[PDB]
Coordinates of N, CA and C (backbone and C1' of nucleotides) in Angstrom, one line a residue:
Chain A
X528 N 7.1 27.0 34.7 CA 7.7 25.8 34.0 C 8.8 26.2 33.1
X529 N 9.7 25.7 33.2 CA 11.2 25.8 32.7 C 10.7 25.2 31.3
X530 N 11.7 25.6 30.3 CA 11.7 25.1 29.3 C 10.7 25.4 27.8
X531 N 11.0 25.0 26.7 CA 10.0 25.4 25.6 C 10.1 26.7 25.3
X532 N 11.1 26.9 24.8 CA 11.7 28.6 24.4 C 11.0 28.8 23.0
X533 N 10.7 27.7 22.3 CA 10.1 28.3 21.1 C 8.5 28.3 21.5
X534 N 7.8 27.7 22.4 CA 6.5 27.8 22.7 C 6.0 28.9 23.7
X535 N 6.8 29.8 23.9 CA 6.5 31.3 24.8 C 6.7 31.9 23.6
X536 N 7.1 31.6 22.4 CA 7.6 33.2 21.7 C 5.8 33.6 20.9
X537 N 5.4 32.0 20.4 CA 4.0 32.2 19.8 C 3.2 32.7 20.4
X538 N 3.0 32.6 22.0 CA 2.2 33.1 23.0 C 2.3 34.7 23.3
X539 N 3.5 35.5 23.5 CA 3.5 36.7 23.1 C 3.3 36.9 21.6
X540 N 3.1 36.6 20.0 CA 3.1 37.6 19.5 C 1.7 37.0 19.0
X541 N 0.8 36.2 19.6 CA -0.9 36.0 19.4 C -1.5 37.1 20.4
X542 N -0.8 38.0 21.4 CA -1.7 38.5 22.5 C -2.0 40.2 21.6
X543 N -0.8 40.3 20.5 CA -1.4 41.5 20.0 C -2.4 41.8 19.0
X544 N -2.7 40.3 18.1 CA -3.7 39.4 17.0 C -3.3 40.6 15.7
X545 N -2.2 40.9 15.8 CA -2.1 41.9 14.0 C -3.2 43.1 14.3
X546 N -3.4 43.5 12.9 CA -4.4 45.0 12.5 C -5.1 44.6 11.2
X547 N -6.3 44.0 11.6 CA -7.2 43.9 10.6 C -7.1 44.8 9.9
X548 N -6.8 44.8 8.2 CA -6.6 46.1 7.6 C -7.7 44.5 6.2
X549 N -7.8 45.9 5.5 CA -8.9 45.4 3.7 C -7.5 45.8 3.0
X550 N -6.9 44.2 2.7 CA -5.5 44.8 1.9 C -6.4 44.3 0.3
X551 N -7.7 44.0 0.0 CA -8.3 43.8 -1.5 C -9.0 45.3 -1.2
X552 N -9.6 44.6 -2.6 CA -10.1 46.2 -3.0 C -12.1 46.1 -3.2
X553 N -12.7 44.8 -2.2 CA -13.9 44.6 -2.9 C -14.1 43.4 -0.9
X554 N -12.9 43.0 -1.1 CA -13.1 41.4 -0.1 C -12.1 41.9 1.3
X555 N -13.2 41.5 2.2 CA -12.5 41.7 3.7 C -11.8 41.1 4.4
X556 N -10.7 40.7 4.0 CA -9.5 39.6 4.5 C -9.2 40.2 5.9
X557 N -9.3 38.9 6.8 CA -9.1 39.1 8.4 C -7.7 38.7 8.6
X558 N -7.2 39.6 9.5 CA -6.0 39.7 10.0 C -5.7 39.7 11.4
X559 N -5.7 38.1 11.6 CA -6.3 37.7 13.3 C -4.8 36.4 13.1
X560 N -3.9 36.4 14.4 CA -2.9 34.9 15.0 C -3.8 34.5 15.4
X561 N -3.9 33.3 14.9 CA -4.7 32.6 15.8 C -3.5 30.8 15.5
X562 N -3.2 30.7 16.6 CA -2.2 29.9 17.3 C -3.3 28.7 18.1
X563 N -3.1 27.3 17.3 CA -3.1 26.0 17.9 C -2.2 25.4 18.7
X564 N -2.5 25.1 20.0 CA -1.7 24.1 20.8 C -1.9 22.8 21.2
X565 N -0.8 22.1 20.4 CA -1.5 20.4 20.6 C -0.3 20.1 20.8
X566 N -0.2 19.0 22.4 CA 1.0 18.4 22.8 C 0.4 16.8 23.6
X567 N 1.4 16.6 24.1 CA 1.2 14.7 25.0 C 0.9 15.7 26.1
X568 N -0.3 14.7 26.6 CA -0.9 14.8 28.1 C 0.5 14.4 28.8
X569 N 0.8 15.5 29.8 CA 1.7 15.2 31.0 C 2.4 16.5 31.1
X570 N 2.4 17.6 30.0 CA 3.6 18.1 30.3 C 2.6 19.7 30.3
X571 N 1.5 19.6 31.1 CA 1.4 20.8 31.7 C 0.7 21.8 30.6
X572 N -0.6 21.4 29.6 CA -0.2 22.9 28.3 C -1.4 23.5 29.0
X573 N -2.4 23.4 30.2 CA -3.3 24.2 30.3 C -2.7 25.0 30.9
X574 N -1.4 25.4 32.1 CA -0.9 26.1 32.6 C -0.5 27.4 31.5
X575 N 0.1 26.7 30.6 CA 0.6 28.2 30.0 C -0.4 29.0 29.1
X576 N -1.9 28.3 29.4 CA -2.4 29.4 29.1 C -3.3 29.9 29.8
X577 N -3.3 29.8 30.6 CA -3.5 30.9 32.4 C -2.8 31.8 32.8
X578 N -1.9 32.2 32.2 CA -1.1 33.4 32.8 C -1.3 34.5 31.7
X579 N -1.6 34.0 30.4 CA -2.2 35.6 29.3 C -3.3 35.8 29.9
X580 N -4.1 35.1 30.3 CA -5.4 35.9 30.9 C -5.3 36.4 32.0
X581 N -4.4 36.4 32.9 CA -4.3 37.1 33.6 C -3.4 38.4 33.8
X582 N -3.1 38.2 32.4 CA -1.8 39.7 32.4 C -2.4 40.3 31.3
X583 N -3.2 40.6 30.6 CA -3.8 40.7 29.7 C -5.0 42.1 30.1
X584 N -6.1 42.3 29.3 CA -7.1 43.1 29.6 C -8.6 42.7 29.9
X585 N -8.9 41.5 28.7 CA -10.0 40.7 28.4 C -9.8 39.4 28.2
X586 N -9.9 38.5 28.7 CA -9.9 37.4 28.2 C -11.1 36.5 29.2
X587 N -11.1 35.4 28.2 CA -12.5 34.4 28.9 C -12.0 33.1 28.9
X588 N -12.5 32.3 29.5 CA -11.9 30.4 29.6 C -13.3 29.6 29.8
X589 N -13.8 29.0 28.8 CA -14.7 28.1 28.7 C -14.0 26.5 28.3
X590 N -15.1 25.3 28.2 CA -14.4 24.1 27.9 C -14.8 23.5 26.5
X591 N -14.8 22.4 27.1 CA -15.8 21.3 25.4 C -16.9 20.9 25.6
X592 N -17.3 20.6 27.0 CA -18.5 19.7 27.3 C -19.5 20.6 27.7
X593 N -18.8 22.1 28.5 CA -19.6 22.5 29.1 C -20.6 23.8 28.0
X594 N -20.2 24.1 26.9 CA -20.7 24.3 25.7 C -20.9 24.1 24.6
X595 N -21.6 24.0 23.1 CA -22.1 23.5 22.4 C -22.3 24.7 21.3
X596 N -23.5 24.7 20.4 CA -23.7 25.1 18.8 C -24.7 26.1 19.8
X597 N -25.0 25.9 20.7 CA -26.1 27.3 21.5 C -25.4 28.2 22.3
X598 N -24.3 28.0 23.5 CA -23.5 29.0 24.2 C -22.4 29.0 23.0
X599 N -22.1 29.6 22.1 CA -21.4 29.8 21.3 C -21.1 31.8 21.0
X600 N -21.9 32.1 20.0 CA -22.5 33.3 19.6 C -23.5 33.9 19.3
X601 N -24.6 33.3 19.0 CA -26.0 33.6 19.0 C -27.3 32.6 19.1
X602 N -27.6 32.7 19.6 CA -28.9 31.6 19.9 C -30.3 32.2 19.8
X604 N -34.2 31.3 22.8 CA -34.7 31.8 21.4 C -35.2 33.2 21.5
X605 N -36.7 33.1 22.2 CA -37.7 34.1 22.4 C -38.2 34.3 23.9
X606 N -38.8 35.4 24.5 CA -39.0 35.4 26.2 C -40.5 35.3 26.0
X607 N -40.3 33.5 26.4 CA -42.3 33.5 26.7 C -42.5 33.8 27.9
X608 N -43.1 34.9 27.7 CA -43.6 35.8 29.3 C -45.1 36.3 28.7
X609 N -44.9 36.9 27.9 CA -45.9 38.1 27.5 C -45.8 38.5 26.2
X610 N -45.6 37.0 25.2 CA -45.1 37.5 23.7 C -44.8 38.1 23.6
X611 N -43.1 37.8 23.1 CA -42.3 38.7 22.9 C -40.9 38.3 22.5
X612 N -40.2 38.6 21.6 CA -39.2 38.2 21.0 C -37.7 38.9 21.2
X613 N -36.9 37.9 21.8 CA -35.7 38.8 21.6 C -34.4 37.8 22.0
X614 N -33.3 38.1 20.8 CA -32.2 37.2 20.8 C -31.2 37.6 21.6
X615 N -30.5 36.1 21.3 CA -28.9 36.4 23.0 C -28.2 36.4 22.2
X616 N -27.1 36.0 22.9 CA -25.5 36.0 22.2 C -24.7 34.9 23.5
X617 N -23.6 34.6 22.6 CA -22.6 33.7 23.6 C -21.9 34.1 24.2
X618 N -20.6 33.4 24.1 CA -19.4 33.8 24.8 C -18.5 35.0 23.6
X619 N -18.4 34.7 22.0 CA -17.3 35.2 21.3 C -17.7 36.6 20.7
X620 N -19.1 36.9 21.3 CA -19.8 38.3 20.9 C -19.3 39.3 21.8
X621 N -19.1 38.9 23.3 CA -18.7 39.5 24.5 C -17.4 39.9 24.8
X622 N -16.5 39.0 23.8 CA -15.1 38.7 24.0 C -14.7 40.2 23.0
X623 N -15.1 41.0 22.6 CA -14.6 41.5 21.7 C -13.0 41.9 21.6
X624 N -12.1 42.5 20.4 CA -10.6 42.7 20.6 C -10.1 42.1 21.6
X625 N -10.1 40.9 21.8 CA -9.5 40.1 23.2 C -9.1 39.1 22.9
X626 N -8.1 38.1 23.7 CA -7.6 36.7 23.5 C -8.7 35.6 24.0
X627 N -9.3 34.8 23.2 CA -10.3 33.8 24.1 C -9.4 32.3 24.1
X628 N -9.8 31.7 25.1 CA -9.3 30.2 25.4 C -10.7 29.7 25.5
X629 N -9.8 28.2 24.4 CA -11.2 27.6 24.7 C -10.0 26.1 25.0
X630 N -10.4 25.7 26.1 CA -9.9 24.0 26.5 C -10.8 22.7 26.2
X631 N -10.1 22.0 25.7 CA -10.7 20.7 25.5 C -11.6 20.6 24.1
X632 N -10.8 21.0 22.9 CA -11.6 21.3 21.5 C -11.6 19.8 21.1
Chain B
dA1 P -32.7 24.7 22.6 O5' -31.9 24.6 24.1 C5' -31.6 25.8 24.8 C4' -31.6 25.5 26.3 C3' -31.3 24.1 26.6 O3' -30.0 24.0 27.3 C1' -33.5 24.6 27.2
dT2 P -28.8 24.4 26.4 O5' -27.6 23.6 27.1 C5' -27.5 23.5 28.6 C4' -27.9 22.1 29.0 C3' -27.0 21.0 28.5 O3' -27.0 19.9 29.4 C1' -29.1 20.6 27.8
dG3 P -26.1 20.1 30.8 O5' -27.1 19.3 31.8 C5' -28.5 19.4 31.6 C4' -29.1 18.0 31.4 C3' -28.1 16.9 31.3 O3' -28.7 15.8 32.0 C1' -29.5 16.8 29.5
dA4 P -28.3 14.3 32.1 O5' -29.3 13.3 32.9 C5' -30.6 13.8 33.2 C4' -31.6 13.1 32.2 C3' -31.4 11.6 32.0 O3' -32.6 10.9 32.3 C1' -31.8 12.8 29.9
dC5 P -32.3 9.5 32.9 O5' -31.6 8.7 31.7 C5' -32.1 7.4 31.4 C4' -33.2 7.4 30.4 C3' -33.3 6.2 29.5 O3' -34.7 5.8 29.3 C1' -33.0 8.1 28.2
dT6 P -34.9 4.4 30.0 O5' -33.9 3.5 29.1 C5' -34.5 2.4 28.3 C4' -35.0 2.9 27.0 C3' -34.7 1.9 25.8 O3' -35.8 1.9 24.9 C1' -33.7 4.0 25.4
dG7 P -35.8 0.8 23.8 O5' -34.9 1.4 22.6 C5' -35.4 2.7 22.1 C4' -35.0 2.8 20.6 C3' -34.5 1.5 20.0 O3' -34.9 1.4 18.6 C1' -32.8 3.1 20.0
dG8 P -34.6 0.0 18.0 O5' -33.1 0.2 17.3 C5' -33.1 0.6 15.9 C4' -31.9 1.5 15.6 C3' -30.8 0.8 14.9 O3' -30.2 1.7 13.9 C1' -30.0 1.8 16.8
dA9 P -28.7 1.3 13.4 O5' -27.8 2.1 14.4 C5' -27.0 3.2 13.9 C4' -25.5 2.9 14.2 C3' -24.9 1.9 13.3 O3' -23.5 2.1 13.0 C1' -24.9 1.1 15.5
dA10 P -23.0 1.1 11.9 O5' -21.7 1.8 11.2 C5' -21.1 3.0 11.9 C4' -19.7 2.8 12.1 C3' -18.8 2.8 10.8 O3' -17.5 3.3 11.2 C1' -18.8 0.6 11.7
dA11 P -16.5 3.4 10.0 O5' -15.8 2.0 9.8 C5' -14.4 1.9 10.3 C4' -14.5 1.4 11.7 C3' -13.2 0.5 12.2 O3' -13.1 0.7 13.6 C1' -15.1 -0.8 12.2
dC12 P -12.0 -0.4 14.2 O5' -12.9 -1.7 14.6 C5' -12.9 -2.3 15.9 C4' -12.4 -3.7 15.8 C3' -11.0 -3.9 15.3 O3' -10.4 -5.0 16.0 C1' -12.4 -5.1 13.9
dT13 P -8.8 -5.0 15.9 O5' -8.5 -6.5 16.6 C5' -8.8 -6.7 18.0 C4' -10.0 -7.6 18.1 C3' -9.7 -9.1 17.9 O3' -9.2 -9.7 19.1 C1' -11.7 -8.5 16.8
dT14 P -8.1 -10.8 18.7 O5' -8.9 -12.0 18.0 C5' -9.5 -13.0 18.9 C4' -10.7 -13.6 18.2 C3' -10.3 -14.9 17.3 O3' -10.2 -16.0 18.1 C1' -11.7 -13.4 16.1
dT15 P -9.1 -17.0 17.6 O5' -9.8 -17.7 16.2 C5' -11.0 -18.5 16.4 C4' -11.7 -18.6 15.0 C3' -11.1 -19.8 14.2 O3' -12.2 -20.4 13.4 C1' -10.8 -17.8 13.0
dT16 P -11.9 -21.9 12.9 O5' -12.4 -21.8 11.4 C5' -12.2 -20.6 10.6 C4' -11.4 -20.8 9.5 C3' -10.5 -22.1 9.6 O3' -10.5 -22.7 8.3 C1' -9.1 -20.2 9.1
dT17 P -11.0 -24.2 8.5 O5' -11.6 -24.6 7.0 C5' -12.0 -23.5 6.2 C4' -11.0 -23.2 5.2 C3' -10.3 -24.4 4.6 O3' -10.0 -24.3 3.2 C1' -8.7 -22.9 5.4
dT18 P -9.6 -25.6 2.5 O5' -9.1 -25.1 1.1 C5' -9.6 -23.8 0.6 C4' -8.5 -22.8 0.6 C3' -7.2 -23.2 -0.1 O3' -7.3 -23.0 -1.5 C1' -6.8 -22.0 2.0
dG19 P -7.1 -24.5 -2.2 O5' -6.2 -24.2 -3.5 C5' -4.8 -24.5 -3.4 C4' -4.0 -23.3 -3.2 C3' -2.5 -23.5 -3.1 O3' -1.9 -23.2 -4.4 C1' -3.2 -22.4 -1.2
dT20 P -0.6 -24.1 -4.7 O5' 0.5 -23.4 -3.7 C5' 1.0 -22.1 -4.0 C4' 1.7 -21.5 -2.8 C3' 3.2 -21.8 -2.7 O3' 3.9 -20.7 -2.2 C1' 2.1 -22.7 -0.8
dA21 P 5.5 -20.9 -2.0 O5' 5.5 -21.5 -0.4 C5' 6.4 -20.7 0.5 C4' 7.2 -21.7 1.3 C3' 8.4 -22.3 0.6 O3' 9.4 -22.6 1.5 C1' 7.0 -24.0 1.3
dC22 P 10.8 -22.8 0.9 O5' 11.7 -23.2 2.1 C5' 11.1 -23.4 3.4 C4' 10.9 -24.8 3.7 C3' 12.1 -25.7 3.3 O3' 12.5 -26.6 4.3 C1' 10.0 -26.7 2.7
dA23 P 13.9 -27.3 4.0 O5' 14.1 -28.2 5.4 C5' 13.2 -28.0 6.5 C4' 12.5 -29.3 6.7 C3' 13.2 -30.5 6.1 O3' 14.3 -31.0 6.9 C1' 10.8 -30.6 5.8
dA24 P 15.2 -31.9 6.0 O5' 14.5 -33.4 6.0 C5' 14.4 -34.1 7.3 C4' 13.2 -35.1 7.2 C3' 13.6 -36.5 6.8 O3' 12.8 -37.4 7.5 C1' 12.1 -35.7 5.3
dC25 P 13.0 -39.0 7.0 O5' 12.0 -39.1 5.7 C5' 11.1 -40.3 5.7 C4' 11.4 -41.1 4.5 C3' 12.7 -41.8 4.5 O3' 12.6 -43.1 3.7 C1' 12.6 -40.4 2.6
dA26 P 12.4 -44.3 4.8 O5' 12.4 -45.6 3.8 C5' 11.3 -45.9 3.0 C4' 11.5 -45.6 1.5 C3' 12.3 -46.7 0.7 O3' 11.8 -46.6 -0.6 C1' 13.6 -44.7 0.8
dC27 P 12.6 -47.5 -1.7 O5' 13.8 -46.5 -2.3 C5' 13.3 -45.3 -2.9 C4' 14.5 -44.6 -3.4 C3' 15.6 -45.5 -4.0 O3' 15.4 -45.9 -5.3 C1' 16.6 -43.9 -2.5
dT28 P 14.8 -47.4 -5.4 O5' 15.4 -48.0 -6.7 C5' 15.1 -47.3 -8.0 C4' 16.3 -46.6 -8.5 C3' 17.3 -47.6 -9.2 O3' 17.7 -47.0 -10.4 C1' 18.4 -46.4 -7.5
dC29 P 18.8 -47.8 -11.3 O5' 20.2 -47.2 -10.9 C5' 20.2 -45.7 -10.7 C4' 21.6 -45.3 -10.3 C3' 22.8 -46.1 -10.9 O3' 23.8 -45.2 -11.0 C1' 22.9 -46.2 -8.6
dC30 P 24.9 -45.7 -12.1 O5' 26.1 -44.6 -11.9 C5' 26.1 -43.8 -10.6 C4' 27.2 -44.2 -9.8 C3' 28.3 -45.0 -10.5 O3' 29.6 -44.5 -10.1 C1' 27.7 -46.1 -8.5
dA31 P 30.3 -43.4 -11.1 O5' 31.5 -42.9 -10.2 C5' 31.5 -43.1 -8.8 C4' 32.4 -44.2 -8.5 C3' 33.2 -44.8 -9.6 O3' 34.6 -44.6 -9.4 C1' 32.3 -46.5 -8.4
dA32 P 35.5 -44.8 -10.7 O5' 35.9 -46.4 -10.6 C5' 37.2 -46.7 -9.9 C4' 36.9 -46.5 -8.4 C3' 37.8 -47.3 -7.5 O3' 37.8 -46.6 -6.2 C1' 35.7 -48.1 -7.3
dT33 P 38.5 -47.5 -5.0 O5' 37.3 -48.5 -4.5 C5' 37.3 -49.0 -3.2 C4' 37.6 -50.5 -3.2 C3' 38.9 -50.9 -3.8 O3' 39.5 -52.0 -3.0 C1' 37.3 -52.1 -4.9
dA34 P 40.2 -51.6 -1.6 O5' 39.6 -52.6 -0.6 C5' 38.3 -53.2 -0.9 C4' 38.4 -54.6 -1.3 C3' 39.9 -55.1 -1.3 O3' 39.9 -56.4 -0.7 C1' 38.9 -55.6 -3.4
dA35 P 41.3 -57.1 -0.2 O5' 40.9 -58.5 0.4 C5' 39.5 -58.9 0.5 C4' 39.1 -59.8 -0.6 C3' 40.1 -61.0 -0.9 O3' 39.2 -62.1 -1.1 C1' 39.7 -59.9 -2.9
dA36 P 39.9 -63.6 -1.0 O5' 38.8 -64.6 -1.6 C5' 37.7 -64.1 -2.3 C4' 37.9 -64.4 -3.8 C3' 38.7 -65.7 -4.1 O3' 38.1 -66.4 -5.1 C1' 39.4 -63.9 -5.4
dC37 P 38.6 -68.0 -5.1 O5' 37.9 -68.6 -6.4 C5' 37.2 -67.6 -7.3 C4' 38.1 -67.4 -8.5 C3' 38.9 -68.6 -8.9 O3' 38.7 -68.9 -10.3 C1' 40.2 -66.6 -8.9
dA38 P 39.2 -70.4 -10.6 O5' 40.8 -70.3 -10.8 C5' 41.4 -70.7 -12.1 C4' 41.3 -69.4 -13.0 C3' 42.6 -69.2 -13.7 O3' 42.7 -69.8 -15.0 C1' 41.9 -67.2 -12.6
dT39 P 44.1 -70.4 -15.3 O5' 45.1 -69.1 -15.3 C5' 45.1 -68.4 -16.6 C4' 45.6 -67.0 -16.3 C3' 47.0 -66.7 -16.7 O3' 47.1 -65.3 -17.1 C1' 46.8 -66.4 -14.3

DNA sequence: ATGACTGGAAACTTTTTTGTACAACACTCCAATAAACAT
């Protein structure tokens, strides 16, 4: 898709997310791009963000409906033979990586 | 479990009758006026 020269430049400089550094001396300030895209239905915004995941290392694509406050990052127990043990979602797995989420 | 039911459910359309707002209207008056009836 032609066009939108200032809307590729945000998209390359979110794929490197900065270098979490502790620039306090007590508090752990995150050092993460994290880039919102909101435009009019018609002009194509789920396309441009299918091509960082595929040129990329890690990346994942989930939606709105098809997850919730349980497939997220941690959720119970394995009733089999008492016995307890917790999961994780999608953003525990994602680690140092770009995640898309569609339809927020 | 998430995904399935009934169970309730907040803005939000409708009217609306309220005052106002401005429309006429018969309008008393007028202002010569004009002819007439004196000169």
């Amino acid at each position: 898709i032609y066009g939108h020269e200032d809307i590729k430049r945000g998209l390359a400089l979110a794929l490197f997310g900065g270098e979490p550094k502790n620039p306090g001396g007590k508090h752990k300030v995150r050092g993460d791009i994290n880039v919102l895209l909101c435009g009019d239905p018609g002009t194509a915004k789920s396309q441009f963000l299918k091509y960082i995941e595929k040129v990329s290392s890690r990346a994942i694509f989930t939606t709105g409906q098809g997850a919730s406050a349980v497939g997220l990052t941690a959720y119970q127990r394995h009733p089999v033979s008492r016995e307890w043990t917790l999961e994780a979602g999608a953003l525990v797995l994602a680690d140092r990586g770009v995640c898309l989420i569609d339809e927020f």
